[PDB]
Design a protein around this ligand. Structure first.
Ligand SMILES: [K+]
Ligand SMILES: [K+]
Ligand SMILES: [K+]
Ligand SMILES: [K+]
Ligand SMILES: [K+]
Ligand SMILES: [K+]
Ligand SMILES: [K+]
Ligand SMILES: [Mg+2]
Ligand SMILES: [Mg+2]
Ligand SMILES: [Mg+2]
Ligand SMILES: [Mg+2]
Ligand SMILES: [Mg+2]
Ligand SMILES: [Mg+2]
Ligand SMILES: [Mg+2]
Ligand SMILES: [Mg+2]
Ligand SMILES: [Mg+2]
Ligand SMILES: [Mg+2]
Ligand SMILES: [Mg+2]
Ligand SMILES: [Mg+2]
Ligand SMILES: [Mg+2]
Ligand SMILES: [Mg+2]
Ligand SMILES: [Mg+2]
Ligand SMILES: [Mg+2]
Ligand SMILES: [Mg+2]
Ligand SMILES: [Mg+2]
Ligand SMILES: [Mg+2]
Ligand SMILES: [Mg+2]
Ligand SMILES: [Mg+2]
Ligand SMILES: [Mg+2]
Ligand SMILES: [Mg+2]
Ligand SMILES: [Mg+2]
Ligand SMILES: [Mg+2]
Ligand SMILES: [Mg+2]
Ligand SMILES: [Mg+2]
Ligand SMILES: [Mg+2]
Ligand SMILES: [Mg+2]
Ligand SMILES: [Mg+2]
Ligand SMILES: [Mg+2]
Ligand SMILES: [Mg+2]
Ligand SMILES: [Mg+2]
Ligand SMILES: [Mg+2]
Ligand SMILES: [Mg+2]
Ligand SMILES: [Mg+2]
Ligand SMILES: [Mg+2]
Ligand SMILES: [Zn+2]
Lengths: 102, 155, 55, 144, 49, 110, 118
RNA sequence: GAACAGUGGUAGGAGAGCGUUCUAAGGGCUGUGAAGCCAGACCGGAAGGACUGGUGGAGCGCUUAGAAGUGAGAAUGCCGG
RNA sequence: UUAUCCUUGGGAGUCAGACUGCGAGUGAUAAGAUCCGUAGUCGAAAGGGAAACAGCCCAGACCGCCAGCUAAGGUCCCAAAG
RNA sequence: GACCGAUAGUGAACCAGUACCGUGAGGGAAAGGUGAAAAGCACCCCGGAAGGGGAGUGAAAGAGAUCCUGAAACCGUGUGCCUACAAGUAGUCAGAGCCCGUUAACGGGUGAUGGCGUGCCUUUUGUAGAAUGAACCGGCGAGUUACGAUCUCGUGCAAGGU
């Protein structure tokens, strides 16, 4: 069994017991979180959403709220004395998928 | 500067043809051993505040010593012998642990001498009181005669 | 004509691939057992072809 | 993230036989180029060769429209001054039919190292018979 | 006051601008003088009036 | 067990000593002595003296057997350069680097 | 008071050379060229973080087309049909099914075919 | 804190900061190892800042304020290598 | 409907422009020519297209995303899509 | 002494107006640091010596005179990954394989192969530019100060202020 869920502005194929990194949710480590937008359920019984599978949900535990490894965004324009340096660490929420309720 | 460094009169080599950068003096500022561009020059840093601001400032720090309960008015301060041990005992008795400014009405040679060698104790006449000395000593020990003399001037 | 660019360490090292010595054409001396250049008198003991030379 | 990538361990190449007889040179070649690259496979991965081997038989029976048999010139240059040499498409199809197909397809493959590796999976034959029975090749019928 | 906790009146003191100390400042290179001409030169500029 | 010898600030250019070192690196000390003895280069007698100094150390200071020794390390490092000047045409002088070498050999039991 | 240059200069330059580790020859060794290459690396990485998104969508589309044509659909027709059937599974996910669960991909494709045949 | 809007940029104007040496006042660290130097996969939106280990062998941070010989990649720049 | 506009004061930089379209002159109704007028873009603008290509077509980069829809231009293969 | 600390500060911390250059007037350098103490390495060994390896001294000798620290360029030795069909502003993003194991992080090294990609600076209408500058590394190297003027901000007092 697996599901395609819509979280962030993105979609992720998830199995039960799978750790996934997603855009930051308003949640805390320990909290169960619920994905309500299941586009497709795979495995033995195949639900195709149109666009969503009605009544399907995926629960997940929040493991961690973090920020990713740092990106130094550096940009310059040759001959124009234009440089711009900016650090970036994108927030994420790490979740373990508990149950896919088709 | 490049005028004051020794030597450096002649052009080091001809303007054109050698393949070197053009140079005017061996003491131009990019040369090792050259003159300094705009370094320090002797000058004063003194300036005067208006006399009324000066009055305000000394009243402020005295009035701040009273708020902080760090003024000690003495009936009088009078040493028999100019002996440091006695001054140190007096300051112990008044619970003056750290730094203190001792203010007398006139020059008191014995008090001056006795406190001279104790670190962070300064003796001063009432005339000689000043903002930095007041703010830079925890306790202000002042005689009643000095208080009257300070009031006379500042009030 | 002068070098237009300096030569990198790598190109200098590639060029020196063949700048090497070879091992001498050496063989054990049958007389004294020291190594000698083949076809030369052995310097150590002065033998060549089972005869003393420096007699 | 999660997009699978084919690699040397994962990849499995079929052998295919394409009959050139009666096919238009460029229409056949464009399809074969795509097979050698692996564009027909869902596991297509742009930095490895996921393609299949292709045998082309009956290369000399390839067709060209218009006046191309007379008028399509194959130039080459020997890099010696004045060393432009030319063959017509008729001369190519008569005497060098394997080269003719190999040039068309080579020009339709990617150009660097992996492209050159992709070309090595092509095998073109003048006649109706190829020597690769041991590779057990299947007939591939060209689409539109 | 305490000499270890001195604090100027807000708005009484500003940091001086130091030109020709890099591109990030916005007065690197030409030190705010633009390009060439008499006004960019050391000792430069015409007399008042 | 290792024995080291070093010749510091020998007047020979490092590049020239390294030609010869490359012949003996990794060889058994018996073979290396032979090679150096039959290699006609300025560096050969200098490197021979270091090699023999290392063997002597191995025997005298550490009771190693000279028959079972191998050259385990062998390198040449740049010593300080003596700077000299050659007069050239048209009143110009040009630099001459009289380079020196630090020659190290380490012998060890096989 | 005089301020010697001191240690700030080498600290700053060392940091650039550390970012130039693994560059070829002088580009990992010499400050002025290491600095140019690290700068250039910034412009490239910015550009390439945008291109990466273009490149993966290109790759997914290629794979969906390959799987689609195994069900007798072109990518174009498939995507039209999926949109009509209301299916919002994206190209990253379709391409994943195409590789990992082709039977599921075929169901989605069969759903698309249904809408096109209407 | 919310909503809404905005955030390409040369000359150039404006703002907010980082770091350097020195001073004053707090407060501290250091032969149980200071500064400097070397290394690392750490931290901050940037300038930059730590931590750990090694070398080193005696000095040095921190806070607030002050003062400047205060920041280099280019000058066919100067000196040395 | 939109949010500019004016005054006073502090501080500038600029006074080599370029091409494109349209309206003129000069020229030969030549010039990637020159000189005005007018709009745009470059200058000081990265991204997509025009093979490559400051000035043309599309379009304005605060950062991140292995999401989606489109513009010009495209969909046999190189090369995404008939 | 909110002056310098050995490229600084005197040209000169040192046997410097020396050496050196010039017919001459004249020009004019470089060059500080063993250790608390010489306790400055008896003796043995290789070597003609230089220089080493031990042994001693010492807190330390990788403090042994070219002696505090000891960066970079540059020169080497070893080897984990890669490399002899490849067209390269040398990276970047994608990416197997192999080798590792950290300030424990959606880690580190290497990089077959794929996509994209004409250094930096200056000067220009416009420069990848077949325009200019830089061999490299290091150090040093450019809006300052005084006195006046004016504006903003701050503070004191205010028809007064000094
Ligand atoms: K200005
Ligand atoms: K340390
Ligand atoms: K320079
Ligand atoms: K016009
Ligand atoms: K001097
Ligand atoms: K590449
Ligand atoms: K020129
Ligand atoms: Mg003079
Ligand atoms: Mg000339
Ligand atoms: Mg000087
Ligand atoms: Mg291409
Ligand atoms: Mg300004
Ligand atoms: Mg500006
Ligand atoms: Mg600059
Ligand atoms: Mg200029
Ligand atoms: Mg001009
Ligand atoms: Mg101007
Ligand atoms: Mg002569
Ligand atoms: Mg400097
Ligand atoms: Mg924008
Ligand atoms: Mg210091
Ligand atoms: Mg300076
Ligand atoms: Mg330099
Ligand atoms: Mg005009
Ligand atoms: Mg024109
Ligand atoms: Mg301009
Ligand atoms: Mg504009
Ligand atoms: Mg543009
Ligand atoms: Mg293009
Ligand atoms: Mg440009
Ligand atoms: Mg295609
Ligand atoms: Mg100092
Ligand atoms: Mg020093
Ligand atoms: Mg001096
Ligand atoms: Mg003389
Ligand atoms: Mg040491
Ligand atoms: Mg000491
Ligand atoms: Mg030393
Ligand atoms: Mg070939
Ligand atoms: Mg090969
Ligand atoms: Mg090319
Ligand atoms: Mg021009
Ligand atoms: Mg010029
Ligand atoms: Mg040059
Ligand atoms: Zn013999």
């Amino acid at each position: 069994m697996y599901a395609i869920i819509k979280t962030g502005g993105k979609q992720i194929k998830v199995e039960e017991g799978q750790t996934v990194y997603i855009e930051k949710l308003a949640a805390e480590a320990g909290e169960t979180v619920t994905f309500e937008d299941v586009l497709f359920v795979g495995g033995d019984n195949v639900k195709v959403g149109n666009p969503t599978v009605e009544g399907a949900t995926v629960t997940a535990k929040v493991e961690k709220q973090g920020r990713a490894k740092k990106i130094t965004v550096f940009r310059y324009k040759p001959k124009k004395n234009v440089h711009k340096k900016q650090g970036h660490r994108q927030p994420y929420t790490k979740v373990t998928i508990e149950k896919i309720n088709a | 500067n490049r005028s004051e460094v020794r030597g450096g009169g002649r052009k080091p080599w001809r303007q054109k043809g050698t393949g070197r950068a053009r140079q005017g003096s061996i003491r131009s500022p990019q040369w090792r051993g050259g003159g300094v561009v705009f370094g320090p020059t002797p000058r004063s840093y003194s300036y005067k505040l208006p006399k009324k601001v000066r009055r305000l400032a000394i009243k402020s720090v005295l009035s701040s010593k009273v708020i902080d309960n760090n003024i000690i008015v003495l009936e009088d301060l009078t040493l028999d012998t100019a002996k440091t041990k006695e001054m140190a005992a007096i300051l112990k008795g008044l619970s003056v642990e750290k730094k203190a400014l001792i203010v007398t009405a006139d020059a008191n040679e014995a008090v001056a001498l006795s406190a001279r060698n104790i670190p962070g104790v300064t003796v001063v006449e009432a005339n000689g009181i000043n903002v930095l000395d007041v703010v830079n000593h925890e306790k202000l020990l002042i005689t009643k005669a000095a208080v009257e003399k300070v009031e006379e001037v500042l009030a | 004509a002068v070098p237009f660019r300096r030569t990198s360490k790598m190109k200098k090292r590639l060029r020196r691939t063949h700048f090497k010595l070879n091992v001498p054409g050496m063989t054990e001396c049958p007389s004294c057992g020291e190594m000698k250049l083949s076809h030369r008198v052995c310097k150590a003991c002065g033998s060549y072809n089972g005869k003393d030379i420096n007699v | 993230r999660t997009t699978p990538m084919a690699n040397a361990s994962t990849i499995e190449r079929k052998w295919l036989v394409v009959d050139a007889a009666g096919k238009t040179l460029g229409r056949l070649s464009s399809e074969v180029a795509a097979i050698l690259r692996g564009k027909h496979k869902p596991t297509y991965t742009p930095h490895v060769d996921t393609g299949d081997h292709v045998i082309i038989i009956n290369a000399e029976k390839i067709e060209l429209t218009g006046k191309k048999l007379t008028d399509k010139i194959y130039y080459r240059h020997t890099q010696h001054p004045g060393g432009l040499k030319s063959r017509t498409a008729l001369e190519m199809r008569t005497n060098y039919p394997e080269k003719m197909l190999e040039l068309a397809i080579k020009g339709m493959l990617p150009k660097g190292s992996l492209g050159r590796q992709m070309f090595k999976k092509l095998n073109v034959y003048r006649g109706s018979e190829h020597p690769h029975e041991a590779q057990k090749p299947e007939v591939y019928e060209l689409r539109g | 006051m305490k000499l270890h906790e001195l604090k100027p009146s807000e708005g009484s003191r500003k940091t001086r601008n130091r030109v020709g100390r890099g591109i990030g400042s916005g007065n690197g290179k030409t030190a705010g003088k633009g390009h060439k001409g008499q006004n960019a030169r050391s000792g430069g500029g015409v007399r008042p009036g | 067990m290792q024995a080291k010898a070093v010749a510091r600030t020998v007047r020979i250019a490092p590049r020239k000593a390294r030609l010869v070192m490359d012949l003996i690196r990794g060889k058994q000390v018996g073979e290396a002595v032979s090679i150096l003895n039959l290699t006609p280069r300025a560096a050969s007698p200098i490197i021979e003296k270091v090699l023999k100094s290392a063997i002597a150390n191995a025997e005298h200071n550490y009771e190693m057997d000279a028959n079972n020794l191998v050259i385990s390390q062998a390198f040449v490092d740049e010593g300080p350069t003596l700077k000299r000047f050659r007069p050239r045409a048209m009143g110009r002088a040009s630099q001459i680097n009289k380079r020196t070498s630090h020659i190290t050999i380490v012998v060890s039991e096989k | 008071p005089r301020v010697k240059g001191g240690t700030v200069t080498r600290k700053r330059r060392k940091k650039v050379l550390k970012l130039a580790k693994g560059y070829f020859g002088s580009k990992h060794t010499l400050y002025k060229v290491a600095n140019q290459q690290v700068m250039k690396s910034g412009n490239y990485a910015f550009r390439d973080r945008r291109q990466k998104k273009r490149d993966f969508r290109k790759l997914w589309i290629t794979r969906i087309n390959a799987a689609a044509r195994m069900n007798g659909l072109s990518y174009s027709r498939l995507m039209h049909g999926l949109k009509l059937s209301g299916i919002e599974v994206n190209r990253k996910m379709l391409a994943d099914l195409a590789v990992n669960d082709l039977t599921a991909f075929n169901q989605l494709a069969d759903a698309a075919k249904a809408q096109l045949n209407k």
